[PDB]
Design a binder for this molecule. Structure first.
Ligand SMILES: CCCCCCCCO[C@@H]1O[C@H](CO)[C@@H](O)[C@H](O)[C@H]1O
Ligand SMILES: CCCCCCCCO[C@@H]1O[C@H](CO)[C@@H](O)[C@H](O)[C@H]1O
Ligand SMILES: CCCCCCCCO[C@@H]1O[C@H](CO)[C@@H](O)[C@H](O)[C@H]1O
Ligand SMILES: CCCCCCCCO[C@@H]1O[C@H](CO)[C@@H](O)[C@H](O)[C@H]1O
Lengths: 223, 223, 223, 223
């Protein structure tokens, strides 16, 4: 079954994405004496990891690897409700297993937050929600624009375009909100670490941003 | 109307570009004790943000997202005067709103200059003008060369080519002039912060550079 | 003979890849007073070096430049056993000569480990094996997905896709295992320096990961 | 005349490349108290600047922007001797003017070496020559492989492939030799600063590497 391949692809893509990218956040200075945070390192790993997973799985599942993307696809009727529930389940499960593998292989002294996304202390949850909405909006707009079959003018790698959209979300928002853009990516390490601080914003922010982008693309700009 | 979609696209593209990219300049060490400035972080965010916005909006508006680009297009008769005034208005308005959103979500202690472009103290305004002229020249030349329909040899992503031209402008000029290349990008945070220091060079420099590049491309090299 | 060209290409590609990339690991602070380790610098050099060598030699040899890739190709019957033995020999020999050239041109005071891949002291060899398995899995999956002739949807540079897969392996795993993904790349400097610590994991980990990826791609996802 | 356009393009491409890229080397800490050297910043600026100039001028002049490339093209009979002398003149002149402009706009306190390429004190000139030979070899091989009309399999941006080859040359060799790969790029700031230390290696090394690569590509691998 093509469908079960696709669901398995979403699970595996998420597992790999989350393991590698959360892995890039590990501060090898430790919790007691943290080394400087390399924002470029993290932003590139998240962006290039998404580019790589879209390259690997785009033709098998569509390479959503993100519940907010899947929800935008449901709301624009590009995927069935039935398919969307299995994708979102696979994405959340994949994120849990990827984060769990990271936990198992990472020395306890440097695990730290295991890459959980958190709102800066000097931000409100409302401002964090807005940041996540906007960064996810631009990501989902990039996905819809890049994959639009009506276009004759798309050039170069679609996967890389999407990955660089992820990268810019991070280069801006890592210190504001952790730059989630992706409810499953936040969910995975939240489950492993039992850290649920403002967790709802990482569902509501990205999902609203994604649906707005998909809606604006499909029904306002390029119907 | 296709035209109103295009104007709205220029506004939205600028808003997102400016929010994310100015956001990358925020020094989370604060004004009292600034951490080292990561020039790669800023250069990549500006370059990849332009690449992403061109990917998203190139087919809707042409993805100028820059009054100097729009002026070069007017002077080479690629866009009408009428259209250019609405584009430039949308670009300036979008930059103001993007910078304003950044101001609202950024803790006051780290707002700093809000990414306003300023001439180094040990540079003259004249040398700043020249720097901005040259970096904008190469950017606009890249745009005209990449989009030239006569060419059969353009390979890979046009958006990424343009974004990397933005990136190199920054990797050179951030410490000289702030590497504007873009009058609206300078205008937005200037309005929010009331900081107008040498502001005219960020209009005159890029506009002259852009018109020279467009003119040289269209009428000297590739007529 | 096309075959001897291909074998010579694998040797030369490996030599250049290893010289440049191990060269990027040299800590010019010295063994006594090491400067901060730039993980981005190393990750980009390894990834972009593979992208460059695939660009240069992909059409001559297939651009494996990696015994684990070659083994995956043997197990999926994409290359003959006979050809695979000469490729693996050329790859190991090329890595030795590249690492040897690096040793000759590098001041003894900064040679350090000559970029040998080692397991972190706070990791077990088993966890190192798992890390190497997973990072090599995603790399080999990227190679099979990117080169799949059945696909009509691959966009942009195949070489760059593969290089960025290498880059993410590093951005995650440099501090865990040295991010080998490549038995020959580990073998070369091991020979020059006589450093064989946990060396077997850099054969077994990548080879298992590669065969699993090739097998899953060819027989489960995209038969 | 197409020929005079091409010569002017080589001059202008070199001017811009050298200004921006040497500009990226300026240490704003000063000669008295230098800040850490960002190798990624410099490597990306040189690589992306070449990618950008090849994008801008490849169809006008061939985008050599490098006397060693031009010599390799002469030796493989891809360009006439007559044309090669004007290209090399334009390249050297462009490099002088670009470096001179940089000197004029850069505060005297941070000019430093103006990005002159020098051999590390703990390297011999012979080892510097070898480093320059190898890094230029891989660059020129990338150019010949990327531009080979017999190939049906080249994917993505040729300009970016070449630029990333430049980038890896730097990520390896900046601290060894300054990673010239380009006699004109070394010549320009040497003229402005009157700094000729080991200057001959930056002609002989790259030229030998370039001719070997061109020769091997055209006559051994892909005749
Ligand atoms: C827009 C709807 C808002 C309803 C609140 C969601 C449920 C509350 O959930 C709580 O929210 C707090 C504030 O963010 C957080 O500090 C807690 O970690 C979280 O558990
Ligand atoms: C080439 C035309 C130059 C005319 C000067 C423009 C108007 C002056 O404007 C002023 O210029 C000063 C010098 O740059 C700046 O310091 C001030 O911030 C700016 O308000
Ligand atoms: C799965 C098969 C495991 C068999 C062990 C391989 C041969 C042992 O080899 C040794 O292994 C040690 C533990 O990694 C290392 O510390 C030594 O450096 C290595 O020589
Ligand atoms: C292979 C041919 C070598 C001949 C030497 C070239 C001319 C000498 O030139 C000198 O070489 C010295 C050693 O590199 C440098 O220290 C000097 O800066 C340079 O002027």
């Amino acid at each position: 079954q093509a469908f079960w391949k696709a669901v398995t692809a979403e699970f595996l893509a998420m597992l790999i994405f989350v393991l590698l990218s959360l892995g890039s956040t590990i501060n090898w200075g430790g919790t007691e004496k943290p080394l400087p945070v390399d924002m470029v390192l993290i932003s590139l790993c998240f962006g290039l990891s998404i580019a790589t997973m879209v390259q690997c799985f785009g033709h098998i599942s569509g390479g959503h690897i993100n519940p907010a993307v899947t929800v935008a696809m449901v709301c624009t009727r590009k995927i069935s409700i039935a398919k969307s529930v299995f994708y979102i389940a696979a994405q959340c499960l994949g994120a849990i297993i990827g984060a769990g593998i990271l936990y198992l292989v990472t020395p306890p002294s440097v695990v730290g937050g295991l890459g959980v996304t958190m709102v800066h202390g000097n931000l409100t949850a409302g401002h964090g929600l807005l940041v996540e909405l906007i960064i996810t909006f631009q990501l989902v707009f990039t996905i819809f624009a890049s994959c639009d079959s009506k276009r004759t003018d798309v050039t170069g790698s679609i996967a890389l375009a999407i990955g660089f959209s992820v990268a810019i979300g991070h280069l801006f928002a890592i210190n504001y909100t952790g730059a989630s853009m992706n409810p499953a990516r936040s969910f995975g390490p939240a489950v492993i670490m039992g850290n649920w601080e403002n967790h709802w914003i990482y569902w509501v922010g990205p999902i609203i941003g994604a649906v707005l982008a998909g809606g604006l693309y499909e029904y306002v700009f390029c119907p």
